[PDB]
Design a protein around this ligand. Structure first.
Ligand SMILES: O=C(O)CCC(=O)C(=O)O
Ligand SMILES: [Fe+2]
Ligand SMILES: [Fe+2]
Length: 366
């Protein structure tokens, strides 16, 4: 058995020659990446932006070190660290990790991918891509008067040593993500969320041998995408991926929900419940925001309707998806676990009704 994360597993991973990510990803300029563009062409595949020009992405120069991160963040903060060889979660202090990171003789391969710092002094040193902020649900529909706290999943600092490996997974809540390498290099293994691939992934996740079975071998194509320094990668909803730190690296990233692929976002969330993924603890109120969005998307439609216009395809599909989800969460035999997530500004029974007819119309009036 070849265990994920081990020196042996890495020998095989580094030797396989996967189909190039160039077969599917789109490379564009920071200026080309607009909400307008996405709403027409769709956001169904990874988008690569080689130069950060025009992304609105601001961050410390290529010399920003791991030592600086400890200063700006505070070596005291306890962080989640990954023992890659054992594919297990550990704990440490930003101080001890840096000490480990800088020692030339690393006795083990440890990785940091969950350090959220928007609540620290290192936050001012970073501004996320404008596109991410334009699409982000939290950026557009989160009321300043809710009881639920606003989620901080927009700024992560990643620091991994050579050969750190994150096994295949789908980002929490089915969120999209942006990724930038300050220095070093990351290698992404990307799998398209085809119905076949999603079923198989959920199967592989709920099987004991998951760690001895390379998921890349269970699908038709596993695209190798090399993210070199200065590059920014945008991974869309539901994409299954694994990442390998080919060399000591520091990168930044963030997660965001949007109106383009609501169907896939709802499918990935429901799957993550079925597998009881500890990751979902990062978007505790995914359902709360879904109600907020439904109210807004209902409005947009009510308008286009009362003025004789037909909505864009993705918007009907998306709203129709929210409809099923909201209705499922209200079932008498289930509402007891979803209830607390219903905002006090929304009338559950009523909203699901307004959605029902608005969808009824569009479907019939077409
Ligand atoms: O860097 C890693 O090892 C994993 C990163 C990742 O999965 C992400 O940004 O969505
Ligand atoms: Fe991920
Ligand atoms: Fe968001």
């Amino acid at each position: 058995p070849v265990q994920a994360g081990t020196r042996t597993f890495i020998k095989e991973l580094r030797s396989r020659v996967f189909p190039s990510a160039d077969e599917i990803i789109i490379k564009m300029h920071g200026s080309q990446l607009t909400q307008r563009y996405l709403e027409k062409h769709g956001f169904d595949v990874p988008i690569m932006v080689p130069k950060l020009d025009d992304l609105g992405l601001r961050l410390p120069s290529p010399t920003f070190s791991v030592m600086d991160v400890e200063r700006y963040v505070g070596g005291d903060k306890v962080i989640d660290v990954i023992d890659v060889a054992r594919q297990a979660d550990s704990k440490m202090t930003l101080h001890n990790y840096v000490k480990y990171f800088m020692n030339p003789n690393r006795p083990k391969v440890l990785n940091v991918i969950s350090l959220e710092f928007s609540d620290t002094k290192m936050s001012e040193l970073v501004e996320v891509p404008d596109i991410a902020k334009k699409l982000s649900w939290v950026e557009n529909y989160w009321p300043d008067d809710s009881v639920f706290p606003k989620p901080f999943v927009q700024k992560y600092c990643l620091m991994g040593v050579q050969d750190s490996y994150t096994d295949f997974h789908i980002d929490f809540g089915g969120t999209s993500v942006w990724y930038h390498v300050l220095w070093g290099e990351k290698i992404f293994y990307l799998i398209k969320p085809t119905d076949e691939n999603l079923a198989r992934y959920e199967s592989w996740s709920s099987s004991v041998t998951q760690s001895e079975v390379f998921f890349g071998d269970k699908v038709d194509k596993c695209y190798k995408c090399v993210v070199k320094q200065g590059h920014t990668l945008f991974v869309p909803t539901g994409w299954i991926h694994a990442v390998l730190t080919s060399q000591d690296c520091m990168a930044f990233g963030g997660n965001f929900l949007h109106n383009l692929n609501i169907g896939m976002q709802l499918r990935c969330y429901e799957m993550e419940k079925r597998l009881k993924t500890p990751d979902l603890f990062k978007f505790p109120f995914f359902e709360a925001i879904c109600w907020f969005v439904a109210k807004n998307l209902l409005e947009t439609l009510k308008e286009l309707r009362e003025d004789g216009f037909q909505p864009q395809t993705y918007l009907v599909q998306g709203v129709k998806a929210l409809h099923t989800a909201l209705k499922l969460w209200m079932k008498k035999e289930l509402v007891s676990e979803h209830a607390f997530e219903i905002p006090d500004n929304v009338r559950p029974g009523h909203l699901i009704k307004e959605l029902s007819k608005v969808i009824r119309a569009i479907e019939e009036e077409n």
